[PDB]
Amino acid sequence: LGGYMLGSAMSRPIIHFGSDYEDRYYRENMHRYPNQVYYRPMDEYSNQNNFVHDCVNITIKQHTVTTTTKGENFTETDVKMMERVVEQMCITQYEKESQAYYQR
Numbered sequence: 001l002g003g004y005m006l007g008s009a010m011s012r013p014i015i016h017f018g019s020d021y022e023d024r025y026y027r028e029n030m031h032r033y034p035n036q037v038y039y040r041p042m043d044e045y046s047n048q049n050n051f052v053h054d055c056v057n058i059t060i061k062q063h064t065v066t067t068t069t070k071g072e073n074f075t076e077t078d079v080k081m082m083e084r085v086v087e088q089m090c091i092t093q094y095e096k097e098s099q100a101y102y103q104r
Contacts (some may be wrong), residue, residue: 009036015084037089052090059086
């Protein structure tokens with residue numbers, strides 16, 4: 001966390017995996033997953049998935065670590081469901097300042 005920020009929530013997205021089962025599983029148990037993602041300003045690694053994967057892994061880690069506190073682990077399914085969400089948020093965060101940076 002040594003030099004990041006918490007810039008916006010972007011509610012709780014819905015991301016239709018392609019299985020009615022997962023689509024319920026998430027819609028029940030979404031609250032354990034995030035509604036905000038940490039990130040940094042553009043300092044290298046800023047184009048397609050580069051920036052997104054870095055902030056994703058931090059926020060998926062922050063969830064991991066919040067649940068090593070409570071006495072849980074997110075199994076890899078929950079983690080992959082989180083990654084869908086945490087990516088969708090961070091892509092939106094790229095689509096703010098970086099789009100002004102590439103405006104001129």
